[PDB]
Amino acid sequence: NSEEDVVKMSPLPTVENQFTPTTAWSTSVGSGIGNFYSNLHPALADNVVYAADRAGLVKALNADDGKEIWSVSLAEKDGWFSKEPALLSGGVTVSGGHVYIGSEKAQVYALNTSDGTVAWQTKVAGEALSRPVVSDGLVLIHTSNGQLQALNEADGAVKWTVNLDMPSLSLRGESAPTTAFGAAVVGGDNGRVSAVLMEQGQMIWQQRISQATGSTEIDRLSDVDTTPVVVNGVVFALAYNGNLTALDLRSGQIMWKRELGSVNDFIVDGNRIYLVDQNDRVMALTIDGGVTLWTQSDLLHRLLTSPVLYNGNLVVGDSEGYLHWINVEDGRFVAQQKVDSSGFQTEPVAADGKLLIQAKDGTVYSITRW
Amino acid sequence: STLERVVYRPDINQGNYLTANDVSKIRVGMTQQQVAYALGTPLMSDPFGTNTWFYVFRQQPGHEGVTQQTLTLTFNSSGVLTNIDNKPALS
Amino acid sequence: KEEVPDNPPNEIYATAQQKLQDGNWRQAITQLEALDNRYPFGPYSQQVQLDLIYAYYKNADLPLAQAAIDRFIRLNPTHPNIDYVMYMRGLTNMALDDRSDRDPQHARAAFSDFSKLVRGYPNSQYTTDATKRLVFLKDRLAKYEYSVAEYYTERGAWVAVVNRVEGMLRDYPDTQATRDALPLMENAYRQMQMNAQAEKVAKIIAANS
Amino acid sequence: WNWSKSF
Amino acid sequence: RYKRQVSGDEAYLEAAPLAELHAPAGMILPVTSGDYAIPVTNGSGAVGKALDIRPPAQ
Amino acid sequence: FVVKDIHFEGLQRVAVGAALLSMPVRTGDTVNDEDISNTIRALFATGNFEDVRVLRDGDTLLVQVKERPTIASITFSGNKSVKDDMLKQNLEASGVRVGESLDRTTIADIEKGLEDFYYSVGKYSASVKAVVTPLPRNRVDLKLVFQEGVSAEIQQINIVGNHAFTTDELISHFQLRDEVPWWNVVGDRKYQKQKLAGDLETLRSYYLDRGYARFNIDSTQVSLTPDKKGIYVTVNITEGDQYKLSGVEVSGNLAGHSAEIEQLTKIEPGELYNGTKVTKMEDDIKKLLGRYGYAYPRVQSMPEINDADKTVKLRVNVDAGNRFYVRKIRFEGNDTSKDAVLRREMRQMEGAWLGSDLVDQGKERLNRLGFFETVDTDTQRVPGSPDQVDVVYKVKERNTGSFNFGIGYGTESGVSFQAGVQQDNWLGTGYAVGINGTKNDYQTYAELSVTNPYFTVDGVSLGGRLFYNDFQADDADLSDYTNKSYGTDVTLGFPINEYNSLRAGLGYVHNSLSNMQPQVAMWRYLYSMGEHPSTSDQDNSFKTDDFTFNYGWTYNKLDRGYFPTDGSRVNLTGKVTIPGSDNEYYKVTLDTATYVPIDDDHKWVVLGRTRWGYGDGLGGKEMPFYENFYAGGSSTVRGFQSNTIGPKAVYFPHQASNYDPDYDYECATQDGAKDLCKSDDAVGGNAMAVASLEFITPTPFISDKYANSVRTSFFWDMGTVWDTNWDSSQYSGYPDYSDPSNIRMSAGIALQWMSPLGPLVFSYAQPFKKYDGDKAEQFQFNIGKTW
Amino acid sequence: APQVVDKVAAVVNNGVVLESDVDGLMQSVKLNAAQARQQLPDDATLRHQIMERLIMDQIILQMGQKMGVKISDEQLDQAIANIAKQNNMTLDQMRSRLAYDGLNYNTYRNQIRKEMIISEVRNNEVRRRITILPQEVESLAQQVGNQDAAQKDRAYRMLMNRKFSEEAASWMQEQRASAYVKILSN
Ligand SMILES: [Mg+2]
């Protein structure tokens, strides 16, 4: 009955901590996200943290001590015997006194930061698996049907919809569009990066960054489930099994390409691109031409999470629950910590000098160092 | 024996299906091709020299009994019908 | 696991022949298979293939014997010893047939192969046994048809019985099975109240017995 | 429980 | 397996001869179609364990 | 360049003459570089050369060639979940097999084919590599190294756009599963495209059966996690409003049977649209047309939907077709089973007009036989005949013998052991021989059975059975007595109505009673038989030989064999000793079970079970005490100890076998006994009447995803057993056991589902109406004793 | 001693590239490089580049043959006549080639015929993968205008040309990987 894995998971590296990591506080959310693959991650805005679980529970916690401000449940009960989970799967996004959350029931909620009452709720084409990006008085949603929709903020009514082709087999998760100069750049599950006007949805241009396709499927997956990054009129995209590419913001010309894919987001700081390969191989490419600077292959197949640049050191979790601090100058580990036994799957959050991360069991942690 | 009927036998069917309208669509002088077109290819013939087509319509539903219609067509050396013998029921 | 040392092909062939004489088929099969794999196109190719066919047949490995027979026929359409290959094909089909009520397709295949052999090589030394096996297979097929006719007589389908007995009288007109089936056709004709046909079959029966 | 093996 | 272990062996079985039927006067038996016909092959070969089915030395 | 000789070097298998024919060039002709190139290209196109180096000497045209190496052996490594023989057959079917030439171009093709097979299986990380090892004499061996990963399992099945039915309820009927509780068997969590199509069609039917005529599935998505260890399935649907059925219209060449079809297309104006009912109507029309000779009566329905009033008008098109007659029915592949065994299952008669329904029924009966792994049909046409066909059945025979073992536990029989070897097809004859044996706390049983399923062509079956049975009463909660009996029994079976089945037979049974505790009922029976034992010792003995005529009748109408929701089952069994036997008595039994659903979904059901029994002697004798009726337990009256309802023993004073203080003894002389005495040991009675009314409801707390696999019910059981021969006048002080008015009642809740250990049934009952001596047992369970 | 005349330089699926063919292409490039030696001064890399050139041509030719694309001689007659503005095409060209490579007349036409098959198939598949959105040419033409009906036409041609090159390059890479190639040179 035993069935070994194709590639052995890498062992836990041994590292001497230059600085001792700590845990400022930790609050528990009901059941977290479980073993399901979801984008649900915490959010931070004005010294308060908003988190949610897959069941439907949503909490607003103080960012200094973890005290709960308000808590609401989005699961409808048909009395005192029935309870249907909401199946929240869209990363919590807070902007302008609203809290936008996606749902696997093709529902999008918009709670109030003050008391948590649902400001409005809307029905979308399909499962809302992407982070509800907010910009220019719109809430872009990338459903699992390949449909990109733009809801209103105050009203919540769908304004326009753009249909993106979907392959027979894809990877769970949808790319979150990035907006710049009144144009939303999104990645499709078919391996193409698309740019659409934010006024009507007209497709400015569409470029394909997938490398190739084999005879069989599965090995020809090219889902661009990352979030494209735009800096100085250049768009960076990273397709699964595909090529990291830099595309001209206006025309979509492929300025340069490199053969390495992933689904975890990447950072663009200064003249360096920090990304986590699909094999859990942290790399630091150069902006000009993608020339590699250093590599860290000591965490192979540990199922890392999206990196976050905190205090000049990248931070990545893993399924085992260890949080690894790795330097950016050379890539050597600077510290390692054990936080939660459930494990880390969703991206960390770093802002306002606070590093937040949520485990599979819903325990939201705030990390510091002394 | 009164026990053969009471038992649960399946429907027993044999021979061609005669609808009482095709049998009225035949006349003396028609050829084998015309007869086959009207009634169909018979399940039985006379292999002992003479050419003769036996259209038997036998059916025996469960605990019902046996009913048979025998339509015998006698042709000639040139495949032309010469005689028709119809037996509405079997004695 | 019945390993075969890397000896010269002449020695391996001599060992295979000696073990064939003793009557032990497994060891001969192993030796000949080793010699075939190691020297697929050596001088001992056709001889080894014929020996393999013989050993597979006598070892009850009928599927492999059949496969080897078809392969040899395909690759040597005009081999001088092809009547022997056809005879072995007939023997293999008869063995597969191996009970007259069971599937007769193997019996039909054996009959076809033996008919081909006898019609192609009347002077072959495997022709008299081929005719004997042909007679036996004809009787077997007629017996199968007679068994089906008996079953339909029991069931009560009087048209199937007459049709099948007519088919026997057409295909196997000179068999004890047909002789024993004639009364079934007479009974079916009488049951369906065709007295003329019943009398004809009665005359046929009387004129013979 | 009931095991049944075909021979 | 065991059933064909005998057929693989030499199992000479000889059945009854084949005799043609007689057609009564005034009628003719059905045609034969020659589908299963046994031709007459002269010569006196060997049958039933008297036949050497060993492959020839060629 | 003129050529005077053409020579070849390196040839191994290809004949020189054949290759010379292949070459466009021939000896004795001018030749140029273009001709050399064409010859090389043709030689390579032959497909048996790896490299060609056509050369020209001073006078001779020398050719050096390298033929494709011959495969010497095939080896596999890592095919843990795929058998080596399976890989070998797949490869030969693809084309690569031992003895052929190894095409160095198809390595990638073979690897990708194997990887595609693994992906179809479900292992999406599987990697396959081929290693080629050269060997002397232009021989090569290929080794296939496999890197099978971990199979991917469904993590969630989601339905988007459903507002009338919960996603869990919809998934409840799906073949694909995302939750597999360890305490229940519902299936595995693997993914297959056939399963996906099947459950999508199941969802479509589920929605169409409720009147959602405009139901539509927009699209479905299958997704994998980045690690490729999980599968997510999403289904998008657009359920419309419910529609009514305005009417049915039939058009086409009905062949003069219009009057009979309008009766098959009658509906109540204002009925909810139902695809299942539409299909049933189409099948009924097809059955009628087939009954009237036609072989392929095509029928189509094209509903017209009017959204203004939400009404559906069915447009049925009927085409009778033509009549085809079956000339022969052939069975191929029945190497073991004889022809008659397969042929007697046929509903289609040879030499009669064809019927597709009849052919399908015959195929289904052949499948039900269980002797064949596969059954296929092929209606081949007869050359030179436009209306005659031959039906051919291809059957792949399967092994029928089976060793068997079983273990179960319960409150009544304790640990139960079963073991037997069966042969359902004896030498391909249809006979079913076998020997079986069971043992529990109070009984060990062993029988040898031989049955002929078709004693008559109609379907009558002749049985046969030799059995040996040992019964220990004290272990069964009865008065102490041992009964070791053996005998034989032959029975017939007459199917009469496709649901009813009579059966009559004879039998001989020899009973040897010993170790009997003296008591009033037993001694009454013994005196009735003329025996004159003594009420002082437990070492009595008694032997009898009886010939009985056993008859019975079984009516079965249950829709399902497991968790039935509708129908009724009635069984009547009898017995009577024919003259010449020591005993003279008759015994009758009657078991009933009726299910009456009270909802469309058949989730709420009412179950009514009754059991009756009576028996007595004929020639002034009594029914044997070992043939009595026992009530109480988890099968007759839940909440009571097994075999506790009914009369209680009344022992006479008697010295025990081996007296030893500290052990309870029943009313012995060594403990100060000088008169008869009442006890609490059941003895059973010759008359019995048990009834039960059980209400079945859905499980309230179990998840609706698999709540249909567990049955919950609240029951109210009644029962009573009495001895008709008890002489109340003589034993005035003791309770009158001949009064049937003593009704025992109980109520409670029962649970029942299937577990890997076997069937499970739990019950807690509180008997609220019991009489003196009855021993109560609230909690009762039975794990796997049904095997 | 025996002198090698021709051989198989590499195997492409069921086809082959002959050592004669590589020599033929070697003349074509050097004759082209004779005009400007700076075009291809390399020798070993040029040999490798030519080897890849023929290999891909064989892949394309086999793909074209599979579909069934065929060209008649009448198209060849029109195809050859291309520089007739200042030459007597099919009259002076036939005679002139006799002094360079026209040992057999069919060789030149036979060679060019293949080049037409690969071009036809290459265009058909490469353009099939191309997709053009109107918003691109509208804005592309606006940029050029900064530097009506006729202007947006130019945007399409440049845009179509730009997409064709990208798709063509990708298709070459994909086809090369997906095919079987083996270099012997032994
Ligand atoms: Mg995706």
Domains and CATH numbers, chain C: 1-209 (1.25.40.10)
Numbers of helices and strands, H then E, in chain D: 0, 1
Evaluate whether G182 touches G10 at the Cβ level (below 8 Å): yes
DSSP E strand boundaries for F598-684: 605-617, 648-651, 677-682
The three-state (H, E, C) secondary structure of C121-164, written as one string: CCCCCCHHHHHHHHHHHHHHHHHHHHHHHHHHHHHCCHHHHHHH
Q: Does B49 sit within 8 Å of E27, measured CB to CB?
A: yes
Tell which E residues from 1 to 58 touch B, by Cβ distance under 8 Å.
27-30
Burial of A62 (0-12, 13-18, 19+ CB in 10 A): middle
d(C-alpha A323, C-alpha A136), whole Å:
36
**Alpha-carbon distances, residue D7 vs C100, F335, F399, F421, F423 (angstroms):** 26, 18, 7, 9, 9
Report the 10 Å Cβ neighbour count for G68: 6
Take residue B9 and report the two structure tokens written for it.
């036998």
Closest to C208 (Cβ–Cβ): which among E21, E35, E45? E21
Which amino acid is present at F155?
Q
Report the 10 Å Cβ neighbour count for A223: 29
DSSP conformational letter for F608: E
Closest to F119 (Cβ–Cβ): which among A104, A216, A278? A216
DSSP conformational letter for F707: G
**Alpha-carbon distances, residue F180 vs F174, F175, F185 (angstroms):** 13, 12, 7
DSSP conformational letter for F270: T
Evaluate whether C83 touches C124 at the Cβ level (below 8 Å): yes
| Close Cβ partners of A264 (under 8 Å, ≥ 6 residues apart) | A226, A275, A276, A304, A305, A306, A307, A347
Backbone angles phi, psi at F513, to 5 degrees: -90, 140
Q: Where in chain G do CATH 1.10.4030.10 domains reside? A: 1-68, 70-120
Backbone angles phi, psi at A120, to 5 degrees: -165, 160
Find the residue in A nearest to G171 (Cα): A212
Q: Does D7 sit within 8 Å of F406, measured CB to CB?
A: no
DSSP-derived 3-state class of residue B7: coil
DSSP E strand boundaries for B1-91: 12-15, 44-45, 52-60, 67-75, 81-87
d(C-alpha C157, C-alpha B68), whole Å:
13
Domain extent listing, chain B:
13-91
| Residue keyed to tokens 């469960």 | B62
d(C-alpha A194, C-alpha A204), whole Å:
8
Q: Does G6 sit within 8 Å of F34, measured CB to CB?
A: no
Which amino acid is present at F205?
S
Cross-sheet strand order for the sheet of A243-248: A229-231, A234-238, A243-248, A254-259
CA dihedral F419, F420, F421, F423 (to 10 degrees): -140
F253 contact B CB<8A: no
Q: Does B43 sit within 8 Å of C200, measured CB to CB?
A: no
The three-state (H, E, C) secondary structure of chain G, written as one string: CCEECCCEEEEECCEEEEHHHHHHHHHHHHHHHHHCHHHCCCCHHHHHHHHHHHHHHHHHHHHHHHHCCCCCHHHHHHHHCCCCCCCCCCCHHHHHHCCCCCCCHHHHHHHHHHHHHHHHHHHHHHHHCCCCCHHHHHHHHHHHHHCCHHHHHHHHHHHHHHHHHHHHHHHHHHHHHHCCEEECCC
Rg (CA), chain B: 16
DSSP E strand boundaries for chain C: none
d(C-alpha A235, C-alpha A178), whole Å:
10
DSSP conformational letter for F541: E
Take residue A56 and report the two structure tokens written for it.
């439907």
C-alpha A263 to ligand 1 mean position (Å):
9
| Close Cβ partners of G23 (under 8 Å, ≥ 6 residues apart) | none
State the number of CA atoms in the 13 A half-sphere of F458 facing the CB: 19
Cβ contacts of F756 on chain D, cutoff 8 Å: 1
CA dihedral A180, A181, A182, A188 (to 10 degrees): -30
3-state helix, strand, coil in chain F (%, to 5): 15, 40, 40
Q: What string of DSSP letters covers F320-374?
A: -----EEEEEEEES-SSS-HHHHHTT-SSPTTBB--HHHHHHHHHHHHHH-SEEE
Evaluate whether B35 touches B55 at the Cβ level (below 8 Å): no
Please state whether at least 3 CB pairs lie below 8 Å between chains C and D: no
Mutate to test the interface with C, among B13, B48, B83 (most CBs of C within 10 A): B48
Cβ contacts of B40 on chain F, cutoff 8 Å: 323, 325, 387
Q: Does G107 sit within 8 Å of F34, measured CB to CB?
A: yes
Please state whether at least 3 CB pairs lie below 8 Å between chains E and D: no
Q: What string of DSSP letters covers A135-159?
A: ETTEEEEEBTTSEEEEEESSS--EE
Evaluate whether A90 touches A103 at the Cβ level (below 8 Å): yes
Q: What is the resolution of this structure in A?
A: 2.9
Q: In terms of Cα–Cα distance, which of A110, A114, A83, A88 is closest to A99?
A: A110
Find the residue in C nearest to E56 (Cα): C81
Closest to E18 (Cβ–Cβ): which among C135, C171, C200? C135
d(C-alpha G45, C-alpha G39), whole Å:
13
| Residue keyed to tokens 């009495």 | F722
3-state helix, strand, coil in chain C (%, to 5): 80, 0, 20
Region label for F427, one of left (φ > 0), alpha (ψ between -120 and 50) or beta (otherwise): left
Evaluate whether G25 touches G50 at the Cβ level (below 8 Å): yes
Q: In terms of Cα–Cα distance, which of F237, F78, F79 is closest to F158?
A: F237
d(C-alpha C38, C-alpha C36), whole Å:
6
Query: Judging by DSSP bridges, how do beta strands F70-77 and F139-146 pair with one another?
Result: parallel
Tally the residues of chain E.
58
Backbone angles phi, psi at F490, to 5 degrees: -120, 135
d(C-alpha A205, C-alpha A228), whole Å:
15
d(C-alpha G103, C-alpha F629), whole Å:
113
Q: Does A206 sit within 8 Å of G177, measured CB to CB?
A: no
Q: Does F758 sit within 8 Å of D2, measured CB to CB?
A: yes
Tell which G residues from 150 to 179 touch F, by Cβ distance under 8 Å.
none
Find the residue in E nearest to C56 (Cα): E8
Take residue G103 and report the two structure tokens written for it.
């040992």
Cβ contacts of G182 on chain F, cutoff 8 Å: 104
Q: Does F387 sit within 8 Å of B17, measured CB to CB?
A: no
CA dihedral G132, G134, G139, G140 (to 10 degrees): 40
DSSP-derived 3-state class of residue F96: coil
Tell which F residues from 476 to 495 touch B, by Cβ distance under 8 Å.
494-495
Q: Does C157 sit within 8 Å of B46, measured CB to CB?
A: no
State the number of CA atoms in the 13 A half-sphere of A312 facing the CB: 3
DSSP conformational letter for F640: B
Evaluate whether A151 touches A202 at the Cβ level (below 8 Å): no
**Alpha-carbon distances, residue F776 vs E39, F477, F641, F650 (angstroms):** 88, 13, 5, 20
CA-based nearest distance C159→chain F, Å? 6
Rg (CA), chain F: 38
Q: Does A254 sit within 8 Å of G135, measured CB to CB?
A: no
Report the 10 Å Cβ neighbour count for F16: 11
Backbone angles phi, psi at F392, to 5 degrees: -120, 130
d(C-alpha F617, C-alpha A38), whole Å:
77
Helix axes C25-38, C46-58, angle to 10 degrees: 150
Take residue F488 and report the two structure tokens written for it.
């034989």
Take residue A124 and report the two structure tokens written for it.
């979308």
d(C-alpha G9, C-alpha G14), whole Å:
14
The three-state (H, E, C) secondary structure of F97-159, written as one string: CCCCECCCCCHHHHHHHHHHHHHHHCCCCCCEEEEEEEECCCEEEEEEEECCCCCCEEEEEEE
Bridge partners of residue A369, in order along the sequence: A21
Find the residue in C nearest to F428 (Cα): C102
d(C-alpha F567, C-alpha F572), whole Å:
17
Query: Which CATH fold topology does B13-91 show?
Result: Beta-lactamase Inhibitory Protein; Chain:B, domain 1 (3.30.1450)
| Residue keyed to tokens 């081996």 | F658
Please state whether at least 3 CB pairs lie below 8 Å between chains F and D: yes
Region label for F643, one of left (φ > 0), alpha (ψ between -120 and 50) or beta (otherwise): left
C-alpha A170 to ligand 1 mean position (Å):
5
Domain extent listing, chain A:
1-370
Evaluate whether A355 touches A349 at the Cβ level (below 8 Å): yes
Name the CATH code of domain G1-68 (choices 3.40.640.10, 1.10.10.10, 3.40.30.10, 1.10.4030.10).
Answer: 1.10.4030.10
Backbone angles phi, psi at F119, to 5 degrees: -60, -40
Q: Does G180 sit within 8 Å of F50, measured CB to CB?
A: no
**Alpha-carbon distances, residue A314 vs A270, A324, F547, G99 (angstroms):** 14, 8, 93, 71
d(C-alpha C160, C-alpha C184), whole Å:
11
Buried b or exposed e, range C69-80, using 16+ CB within 10 angstroms: beebeeebeebe
What contacts 24+ positions apart, CB below 8 Å, involve C24-31?
A: C25/C55, C25/C58, C25/C59, C26/C2, C26/C59, C27/C2, C28/C55, C29/C55, C29/C56, C29/C59, C29/C61, C30/C2, C30/C4, C31/C4
Q: In terms of Cα–Cα distance, which of C72, C65, C71 is closest to C90?
A: C65
Q: Does A205 sit within 8 Å of G131, measured CB to CB?
A: no
**Alpha-carbon distances, residue F365 vs B76, C206, F344 (angstroms):** 46, 42, 10
Query: Which CATH fold topology does G70-120 show?
Result: Triger factor/SurA peptide-binding fold (1.10.4030)
d(C-alpha A194, C-alpha A207), whole Å:
6
CA-based nearest distance F561→chain B, Å? 22
| Close Cβ partners of F615 (under 8 Å, ≥ 6 residues apart) | F585, F586, F587, F588, F623, F627, F629, F686, F687
Mutate to test the interface with B, among C186, C192, C193, C197 (most CBs of B within 10 A): C192
What contacts 24+ positions apart, CB below 8 Å, involve F755-761?
A: F755/F183, F755/F184, F755/F185, F755/F783, F756/D1, F756/F185, F757/D1, F757/F783, F757/F784, F758/D1, F758/D2, F758/F408, F758/F783, F758/F784, F758/F785, F758/F786, F758/F787, F759/F783, F759/F784, F759/F786, F760/F784, F761/F634
Closest to F224 (Cβ–Cβ): which among A5, A87, A169? A169
The vertex-E43 CA angle with E39 and E47, nearest 5°, equals 90
Show me where chain E is broken: residue before each gap, C-N > 2.5 A: none
CA dihedral A306, A309, A314, A317 (to 10 degrees): -40
Closest to F40 (Cβ–Cβ): which among G13, G18, G184? G18
Ion ligand 1: residues, CB < 5 A: A 170-171, 173, 189, 223, 225
d(C-alpha A269, C-alpha A275), whole Å:
11
Q: Does B56 sit within 8 Å of C162, measured CB to CB?
A: no
Evaluate whether B88 touches B55 at the Cβ level (below 8 Å): no
Report the 10 Å Cβ neighbour count for A176: 24
CA-based nearest distance D6→chain F, Å? 4
F498 contact B CB<8A: yes
Q: In terms of Cα–Cα distance, which of F177, F165, F232 is closest to F204?
A: F165
Which amino acid is present at F659?
Y
Q: In terms of Cα–Cα distance, which of C4, C11, C62, C58 is closest to C33?
A: C4
C-alpha F219 to ligand 1 mean position (Å):
16
DSSP-derived 3-state class of residue F21: helix
Q: In terms of Cα–Cα distance, which of A83, A54, A57 is closest to A68?
A: A57
Q: Which domains does chain F have, with CATH numbers?
A: 2-67 (3.10.20.310), 70-147 (3.10.20.310), 153-238 (3.10.20.310), 244-321 (3.10.20.310), 325-397 (3.10.20.310), 470-783 (2.40.160.50)
